[PDB]
Design a protein around this ligand. Structure first.
Ligand SMILES: O=C(O)Cc1ccc(O)c(O)c1
Ligand SMILES: O=C(O)Cc1ccc(O)c(O)c1
Ligand SMILES: O=C(O)Cc1ccc(O)c(O)c1
Ligand SMILES: O=C(O)Cc1ccc(O)c(O)c1
Ligand SMILES: [Fe+3]
Ligand SMILES: [Fe+3]
Ligand SMILES: [Fe+3]
Ligand SMILES: [Fe+3]
Lengths: 200, 233, 233, 200, 200, 233, 200
């Protein structure tokens, strides 16, 4: 058969990932421009939300050195790939869990609907990549919203998960923080209630 | 907005390190036990951020000046980012981080007894050029002892992060130095089953890129997933 | 006074580097053109100084403290001094000198742009024990660029001087580190014709002698000329 | 045939030899005890002398980074191998050439006579080993005195040198420095008047 | 690198280990001198205690063929290596679990404090080695006492265990047996509440 | 009392059998799922009991006389206990146990149909000499069927327990006999991943140590963790 | 390490080199346009000079089949790379030694000052490449002028030559030919007064 060049192999990010990808967190001076956790500026169209979560290992312990990267469409369900600190909205962000509480936060807007390759609409979702010490190759997942039951039920992606019980692991629970709309998305790397991770 | 015009060669999960590699202790509790769910590529996965407009500082890629001159072996780390087809990856973000000459990281959590270097930070970023070339200037990091087995030491290495054209191609890896006797003893390195895969992680001494009487150079090429146009979909 | 009771195995001048090795520029004008005159061994050659009573300081052999903690890879350099017969050489003087982590020597004449380390001198001395064992604690030196060819770089190395039992056994040499890609490219190293001889100069990583979470170790054994009793003379 | 373990191969001392074997010269702080160029203390028996010389390369240029080690008997023609800074006489010494003038000096006493292995007396001599940058393996030579013509003529070692003209290269020329007896011993590594170097 | 001679590989003790190390338990006649579970003679200094416990498998079933070896300091925090049946106290002992009830016992005294390599005092502890069928290479653990919370909190060893919840597995629970001071120390080889095992 | 004067070479957990070796059924539920926690060596780990004053019986090491003459092949099992450095381990405790000529153990739990040997116990103990030498006199045990797979047979073996200088060196193992065809089919033997490690478990026929017209001999040497003095701690 | 394609190996130009690069000298008819020894047209700016010299072998005998190539800056210290016979000045020229007298000549102007890579001005010089039979790989040298002693003393290049006496070999001696300013530059390939050759 035909063999191409092999992709460079992945390696864990390690516990010091912060010095390189989350300077503040590393407790180091930042540069003029940094990619962080604020995807939308106050004057950005769409419904402003706060996302927050915790990451658990197989023993039920918090993963305090985790690093996450997100990719989502804007409120119009469009991907803004031209990253710029001047934008009112950036489709991409970076976040990490506190060495203390071990919770991550992201300031964004609820994503608009996008169609799959076959033209079927997918429920509003946020693409997540999780990196950390002990993680050889990053994990891919999706965050869906509990208040989008109707859409969620019809998602061509959610429906690829054989066991309905497993689908619930991708649904973020709507809450309120300081009187602001928030959604909680906890990730269980291993064991009971283990979060669905994708390959693509 | 980004558009769904590409497809990426499926990853070879047998080439890459598996999730569960018990010699690397922490992987025990941080690896899923359920199988990964395969999904078709969509705009969500085939797109990613472009960092062309990020405001890079003048010494973003020069660790010798971005933080006095650091103590350690002055080296240049250069190479090219290509896809599996051999096609260059221009205007892509390449980020790196490492320890100092003594194996000490400038991070809260690093308690190794080797001292910090007042003139060294350990972070760099570079956008590849039209030909997919990137380059950094830094000092060769020292081996780092870690709590794994009772006498585990990480080979000198530099952490690399590469974006590529999509979230599908995004990768975090590590560079090792040609000939390091520690390489074959590292549980993290060994997370990789194929010896041939290990070889792709070893930067080669590059005398041709060295600055005589100044600094040496190492060549490190990175291969991202092959990008192709959709067909008969 | 010393006495003529021994004879030393004649040196193998084909094992050792020759005088004239043109790739090593300076050897051109500093090598005799006349043949060496062979002479029988006498008390003059079969005797040498004993350094048992030299007043050694407490940190004579510890470069980490003999001059702040230096920046660089903390290592232990240990080994044994034996003769060609395999017999240990006890109470012998072993002296060493090297550059810092960046390839900078603490010598007037060193103009290399890498900076000096305020906490590092670069000199050590140790008297071998009854078993011919010696040990030093220091930092791994960096490669050093020198004016030979337009892009010559000395592999990381430590200079060693060993007295032995006589002036006949006295030797000056250099230690290289296992796996250094620079080794086979060095004109000084190459002054040695036999690849097998080169191997004796390479210190091997010694994980067994390492101090977990502290410092690594390298093993370097030195072989001096065989000593035998005179017979039927 | 029988092969023993091979001796560790020699390597040049390099130009920085001073940091390790001649600290002062390197322009570095010395330790409590150092092996230097004063073999005899004023109260040492024998005829006190000053030795001085220069080292020339094949182009007739001074070798300013040379390092020499000497070994000689005391005035009674006895080798004092027990090195001690407290001794009135030490059989061993170290010296180097000035980066400036490029001249080395040694403070000692004229050596007594010693017999070879066959019981034949050798003329008073000093054993010299020369180390330097460009020198792969150190050079062995002997310093003899011009005022010992009688002895010199009968030396079993000097007489091993086939060409009489070559023997003169090992004879130090008696002089006076500050009204003190001195002997000058210049070494020519290569070319015209090349000094005799031994193998043993 | 430098390679030494490889250590002889370990093998399971097997289910008949008693025949060699727990004669009485094998149901065989013992010899004059045997190494057993009575570390201290009644007339030994320090606080006399009785230790007991069970061993569970990954299914929560009792391990009735387990063999244990202990090493501890005397009441003065001293290791008595010279094993003698005449001593009032011995630092070493052997015990095994009943084929019936599957409980092991040990008669000793509470160990005194010992300092680590760095000079830091470790909380009073007993070193345990667990052998048994299905165990290819013995397991190393430490027994700590619940009434020494202060010392326990500052133990350099206990503190190397990342998760606080895992440290609890090493703490024996004080009780009383026939009006005697006893500590119960159960070992869970695998699963829920899995005991901390060491490498050194 | 004991003193913290030594350090022991770290164990190679890839040489020894792993905890979970599924073909050896019982290991499934008796192997930890969490990684071992590595700890620095302290006096706790670097000291152990000395059995020099234990009151050994005169026939402690003679299985022929310590329990009629047993039926089976009369053999001497002798060897030496050394450390990784090749240094002898004197005055150490070596204990052994085994089955009779038919594969039957003198143990409650043994319900194998082969009968017991009225004159055979199957236990011995020996304290190594100044040179690290031990010796036992016994009869060669027979293979033993066990409930693992439906037709598993343990090769003839002798169980061994060695103390060494500390609890760090203490070891339990099994000796196998040279040429036994069952060796390579045994799930327990197979718990050892490296064929080279298995080789260390095989006792070789030793005709030189045999007593003509009486008994054969087998040689079994044991290597315990290398012991070294502390340094630069 | 990284290995590139190997450069094509050099070969001696041979004794008939003239047929290809010094047509007139071969005694062959020339072509319309030839590269020769007249770098400057009489109407060219700067100080017009005549350069001449001989080439000696290791025996002190003349090398009459030598071929030389020169490269120099104009009077403003500028390299004119666009070779054209119409230019008043060309930076490149070719010359050769007479099969009879064995002397080469060149008509040019005194070169202006150029800075090295570090920004330090080099003394006025002409780059020379010497080819000839018996010369496997061409020799590189530089011609300096004796009436520029000040600049010469501060040349970063001249100063890389360890021995002061060797630097003198690169200094052309001013004279006058037919009332014209001339500089004599003899090349000694080997031996006494051997000219300094470079590697770059
Ligand atoms: O704990 C781990 O995951 C291994 C490790 C530790 C420190 C590092 O810097 C690193 O790159 C990898
Ligand atoms: O010039 C030489 O002889 C080569 C060289 C230069 C510097 C050094 O430190 C060294 O050890 C060897
Ligand atoms: O059940 C097992 O662990 C295998 C086994 C059975 C009996 C033995 O004597 C033995 O040494 C090993
Ligand atoms: O004398 C020599 O250098 C050899 C030689 C002679 C004639 C040639 O044409 C040639 O190319 C080489
Ligand atoms: Fe790292
Ligand atoms: Fe050097
Ligand atoms: Fe058995
Ligand atoms: Fe030709």
């Amino acid at each position: 058969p035909i063999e191409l060049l092999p992709e460079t192999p992945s390696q864990t990010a390690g516990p010091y990932v912060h010095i390189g990808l989350a300077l503040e967190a590393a407790g180091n001076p930042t540069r003029d421009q940094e990619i962080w956790n604020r995807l939308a500026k106050p004057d950005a169209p769409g419904e402003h939300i706060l996302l927050l979560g915790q990451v658990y290992d197989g023993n039920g312990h918090l993963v305090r050195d985790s690093f996450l990267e997100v990719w989502q469409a804007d409120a119009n369900g469009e991907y803004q790939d031209a990253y710029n600190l001047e934008n009112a909205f950036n489709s991409f962000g970076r976040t990490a869990t506190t060495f203390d509480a071990g919770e991550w936060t992201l300031h964004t807007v609820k994503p608009g609907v996008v169609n799959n390759a076959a033209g079927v609409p997918m429920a509003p979702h946020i693409n997540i990549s999780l990196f950390a010490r002990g993680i050889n190759i990053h994990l891919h997942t999706r965050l869906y919203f509990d208040d989008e039951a109707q859409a969620n039920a019809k998602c061509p992606v959610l429906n690829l998960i054989e066991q309905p019980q497993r689908r619930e692991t991708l649904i973020a629970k709507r809450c309120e923080v300081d009187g602001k709309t928030a959604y909680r998305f906890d990730i269980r790397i291993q064991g009971e209630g283990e979060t669905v991770f994708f390959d693509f | 907005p980004a558009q769904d015009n590409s497809r990426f060669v499926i990853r070879d999960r047998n080439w890459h390190p598996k999730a569960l590699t018990p010699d690397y202790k922490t992987s025990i509790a941080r690896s899923p036990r359920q199988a990964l769910v395969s999904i078709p590529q969509s705009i969500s996965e085939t797109t990613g951020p472009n960092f062309s407009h990020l405001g890079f500082g003048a010494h973003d890629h020069d660790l010798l000046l971005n933080f006095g001159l650091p103590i350690g072996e002055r080296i240049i780390v250069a190479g090219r980012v290509v896809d599996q087809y051999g096609k260059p990856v221009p205007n892509t973000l390449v980020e790196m981080w490492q320890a100092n000459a003594g194996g000490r990281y400038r991070h809260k959590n690093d308690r190794y007894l080797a001292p910090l270097d007042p003139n060294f930070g350990g972070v760099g970023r570079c956008l590849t050029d039209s030909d997919g070339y990137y380059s950094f200037r830094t000092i060769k990091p020292g081996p780092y002892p870690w709590r794994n087995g009772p006498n585990d030491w990480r080979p000198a290495h530099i952490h690399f992060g590469i974006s590529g054209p999509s979230i599908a191609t995004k990768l975090i890896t590590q560079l090792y130095f040609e000939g390091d006797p520690l390489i074959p003893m590292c549980p993290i390195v060994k997370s990789i089953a194929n010896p041939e895969a290990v070889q792709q992680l070893i930067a080669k001494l590059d005398m041709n890129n060295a600055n005589p009487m100044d600094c040496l150079a190492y060549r490190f090429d990175i291969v991202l997933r092959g990008q192709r146009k959709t067909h008969f979909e």
